[PDB]
Amino acid sequence: MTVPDRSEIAGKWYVVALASNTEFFLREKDKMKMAMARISFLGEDELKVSYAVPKPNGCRKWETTFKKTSDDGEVYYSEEAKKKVEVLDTDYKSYAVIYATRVKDGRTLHMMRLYSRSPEVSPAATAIFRKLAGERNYTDEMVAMLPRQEECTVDEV
């Protein structure tokens, strides 16, 4: 158990960037703090993810299971949850940017996010995430960033 095998392909990721299509999310997220994300391979076609966010009520965490969906190569779709995530770009030794979308009966929501190899936002990741954001005619309130405001973190093992 807990062998150093596939585990190398999984771990924890710190989301130091955020983007929301709905004003409310932007308003709420812009006022909150950086979030967490840890993913674990449930199966060959199934995957599990643990979320950690600092909520006024305390560190709010949650773990959800998704299904493999190699849309744009290592993308994931959670039909049961109505949430899709697609890794846009990621550095083996640097920052990474992943795109996410969720659709509800009659409504489509998109949420862009950026994660750092550790709980620390980098200028490079910032400029990169923004460069793409600007290419889509994004607006400041549409994006959300968290500076050296870290404190609550999610465990890995």
Ligand X SMILES: O=C(N[C@H]1COC(=O)[C@@H](NC(=O)c2cccc(O)c2O)COC(=O)[C@@H](NC(=O)c2cccc(O)c2O)COC1=O)c1cccc(O)c1O
Known binding-site residue numbers: 22, 51, 83, 102, 113-115
* Residue 64 beta carbon to ligand X: minimum distance, rounded to whole angstroms: 4
Q: How many residues bind ligand X (CB under 6 A)?
A: 14
Q: What are 28's two structure tokens?
A: 């709420």
What residues have CB less than 8 Å from 20, skipping those under 6 apart?
26, 29, 111, 142, 144
> What is the per-residue burial (b if ≥16 Cβ within 10 Å, else e) of 58-73?
eeeeeeeebeebeeee
> Of residues 15-74, which lie at the interface with ligand X (CB under 6 A)?
15, 35, 37, 51, 53, 62, 64
CA distances from 130 to 124, 137, 138, 143, 148 (A): 10, 10, 9, 8, 18
Interatomic CA distance for residues 77 and 19, integer angstroms: 19
* Position 142 contacts ligand X (CB under 6 A): no
> Looking at 111, 142, 145, 146, which residue binds ligand X (CB under 6 A)?
111
Q: Does 100 bind ligand X (CB under 6 A)?
A: yes
| Closest CB to ligand X among residues 5, 122 | 122
Q: Which two structure tokens, joined as six digits, stand for 107?
A: 């409504």
Nearest to ligand X of 3, 118 (CB atom) = 118
Least Å from the CB of residue 99 to ligand X:
10
Q: Which is nearer to ligand X, 62 or 92 (CB)?
A: 62
Phi, then psi, of 97 in degrees rounded to 5: -125, 125
Contact 13, 94 (CB under 8 A): no
Q: Tell me which of 10, 42, 87, 109 binds ligand X, using CB under 6 A.
A: 109
Residues in contact with ligand X by the rule CB under 6 A: 15, 35, 37, 51, 53, 62, 64, 81, 83, 100, 102, 109, 111, 113
